[PDB]
Design a protein around this nucleic acid. Sequence first.
DNA 1: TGAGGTAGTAGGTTG
Length: 745
Amino acid sequence: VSNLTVEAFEGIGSVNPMLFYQYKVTGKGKYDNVYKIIKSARYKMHSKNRFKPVFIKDDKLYTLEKLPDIEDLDFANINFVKSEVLSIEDNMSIYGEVVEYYINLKLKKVKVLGKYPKYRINYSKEILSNTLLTRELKDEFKKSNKGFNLKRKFRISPVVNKMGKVILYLSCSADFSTNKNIYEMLKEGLEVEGLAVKSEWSNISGNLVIESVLETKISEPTSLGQSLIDYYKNNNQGYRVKDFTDEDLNANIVNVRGNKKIYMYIPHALKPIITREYLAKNDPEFSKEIEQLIKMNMNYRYETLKSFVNDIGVIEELNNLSFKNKYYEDVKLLGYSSGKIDEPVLMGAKGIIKNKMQIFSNGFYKLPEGKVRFGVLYPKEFDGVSRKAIRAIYDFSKEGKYHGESNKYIAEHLINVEFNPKECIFEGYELGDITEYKKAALKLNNYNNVDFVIAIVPNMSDEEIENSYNPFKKIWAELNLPSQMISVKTAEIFANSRDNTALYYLHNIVLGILGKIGGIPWVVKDMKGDVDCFVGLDVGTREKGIHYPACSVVFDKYGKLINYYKPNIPQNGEKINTEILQEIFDKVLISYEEENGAYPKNIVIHRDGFSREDLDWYENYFGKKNIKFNIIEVKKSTPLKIASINEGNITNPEKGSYILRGNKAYMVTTDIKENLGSPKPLKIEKSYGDIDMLTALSQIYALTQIHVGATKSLRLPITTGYADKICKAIEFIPQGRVDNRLFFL
DNA sequence: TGAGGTAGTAGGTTG
């Protein structure tokens, strides 16, 4: 009965064709090939009007209400040339943006009381609500005494239908904004360079990372041929310059990058972005207040968007268009298909397991071998604490958790290690300069038989402790010494241990120390399809082209072993060409040859958000390598979210259920109860391959289940998740480019 | 950093 529905809405009416004052871009100056010029000229025309909507074709610029003037800026000349009512089916995104603009106009006049209104409107894709609906539906706007307003960011996405119907894909998010501005913080004498900055005079052209405060005066002429206020006064945006004084224009223009070119903004227009973590740092109790409000389950999001579409109401400008007040009872009416895939059984050493708990009763599937002997590096003021902790770790690693060496859930000799406190070494470090931690790690290196240090770091809770996790990782990753550090907090847990949370921590940390060496605890008994090998692909963005940093080729259909290969790129400036990918898959093939001796017949490849530009290379190469294969894209961050729908109630979806359109699939992987928010599902589509998507989803969900670094499962698959975690710890690769051991846990 | 969730990120680019 568990039916599923994405966060979207049905339009009641049907839109009509309407007359469009179409404009043609004509090139001006040395900016020929105007296809790049249109994207700026839209916002330019949208700025010369008071955000009247300007639309995009390859040379045609459609507008509901005419800007009768020609334009004078040097990029293009734009003319009136005669209007025409457009078609419906040819203009899908066009009428979608029509629905966007009229939802903007309708919600511009919405308030809760006689004050600043309910929503803040940029006539754009995103909608900010000035107030915020709570679980008691009271719409109380949230505000700290130090600023830092909490607002809902609504990303609407209407799509029209060729029969005139419209579907409103609707998404709700949280936004953190202060009242303090960049001009105000520059009056504060605070250096703001490198801060991620959004602008509020402008629109969606964001992620505008700031560059440098200049000597440059606003009132004096700049590179743009005018004063920076004259940028707005000569346009119709002079209304934003009707609160300035002589003092308000002394200390002035900052530079800011917009992914293509530096800009010059008024600092008044610029505002800092605020993360969850920036607010939690600066104002922790306000974050404690809004902690209930940031995490949103499907009931809360659904009530939010109920109130939102009730605020929308009807649009009498359009053909009496209104939306429904609830989600769909089916995605098949939307154009998807649903279901819940099983999770296949897993297996370790002894055989098929029932859960990820009893793997320690049933032994680890893969062990690196060589009887690693761990050494320990501890803070000197926690000596007996460290002794009890490592004693617990080693005794659970061989016999059991308590003094009562439990075999109710634990088998003997789960990892071949030897630790005599008399023989094997454990040495202390005192807190201080980073040079001391380096001397301690190097002193550890001076001994022999110290393979796989297990150290103890102070807490990240106490900020005034300068805990040496990162220097220990750097020095021990310079060597081939895998590491596993623990907090002094969990060290006190191991010391003051009477309940049975200690076994949970020990399950967790033993999976960690197994993963740091080349050992695999449990793998899949049976996949569905006939794939032989798994290859993971991430993004690097070293250049905005075909950029690719690192691969993690999971060996078998079992997943029974895992290789990762970091192609140490020839010096940066060398081409990012698929010759790199040739090296990658040759390494993959020889790796599968060392593991099996036979060529893998079928390989699925999981790529990240770097686009579908080079499928033909994989085609030609694997055709010459005579091997059928699959390529399935995994996008880790999607705005779209899936809600399990009962009779009328809206719960979070149970894990392992999917939403499927032909070669575009959504599914949920994690299990999140209602107290912790929403599950962020996966965006999954097959670029090229042969298998049905159900087999791919079953394989990739069992591939989210098996994992080497933790007890409970993950959101990401093993492939792109492990590749991305390698892509995080770039300075932490032991530079040999290929290891069976996984440092990055 | 016991581990994992969440939340945060814009759609092929816009002084």
